[PDB]
Design a protein around this ligand. Structure first.
Ligand SMILES: O=C1C[C@@H](c2ccccc2)Oc2cc(O)ccc21
Length: 212
């Protein structure tokens, strides 16, 4: 009984299948990001986090039979989602037009702070983050355009860009670095991600699947 979610007229299908991997994923949650200007929340993007179908069996061991309220306050639960042995697919769709460098600047900031935070920001991670930046330089995201982060459990982060919300056929780049590969999702649902919309969605939707 997995449903879809619409955010500012941007829809996130309940389930999806990738042309690049051939696996299928279910919508784990959705929400929105932006900037708070003069006390006002200014929306710029919508975010959807998908989990590989096999994430259920994996998470079932430790989190089956827990209330949504209980999962939401448990950090270890989100750590399993972030680093669990399955792919996570994040799709960010624009509400307001941002150039590749405009959008990527803040993402990279949050990722670098996290990486330095946990002591995993050496030359390799720096180089990987530069490659990350390099991939965004040639693109522009008008309203509706999307960015796809494919977090492979094998320590690789795949980057895709779409004129709209349909999954691209090929990936634009592969960031091969373990620490960086999970940094992006970390800044969305990790312990130091202020916005709880995504975290709450995960707590509210997962319990159902874990029980069957
Ligand atoms: O989904 C977004 C929006 C993006 C953003 C939005 C508006 C202006 C600059 C950057 O910031 C982010 C930073 C992150 O670590 C993760 C996700 C996002």
């Amino acid at each position: 009984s997995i449903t879809a979610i619409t955010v500012e007229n941007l829809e996130y299908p309940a389930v999806v299948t990738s042309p690049v991997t051939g696996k299928s994923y279910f919508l784990g949650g959705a929400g929105e990001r932006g900037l708070t200007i003069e006390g006002n929340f200014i929306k710029f993007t919508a975010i959807g986090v998908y989990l590989e179908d096999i994430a259920v069996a994996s998470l079932a061991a430790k989190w089956k039979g827990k209330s949504s309220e209980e999962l939401l306050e448990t950090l270890d639960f989100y750590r399993d989602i972030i680093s669990g042995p399955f792919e996570k697919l994040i799709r960010g769709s624009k509400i307001r037009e941002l150039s590749g460098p405009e959008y990527s600047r803040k993402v990279m900031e949050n990722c670098v702070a996290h990486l330095k935070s946990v002591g995993t920001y050496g030359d390799a991670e720096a180089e990987a983050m530069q490659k990350f930046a390099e991939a965004f330089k040639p693109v522009n995201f008008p309203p509706g355009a999307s960015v796809f982060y494919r977090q492979s459990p094998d320590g690789i982060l795949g980057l895709s860009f779409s004129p709209d919300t349909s999954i691209p056929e090929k990936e634009a780049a592969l960031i091969e670095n373990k620490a960086v590969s999970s940094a992006v999702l970390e800044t969305m649902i990790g312990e130091h991600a202020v916005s709880p919309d995504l975290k709450r969605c995960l707590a509210a939707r997962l319990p159902a699947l874990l029980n069957e």
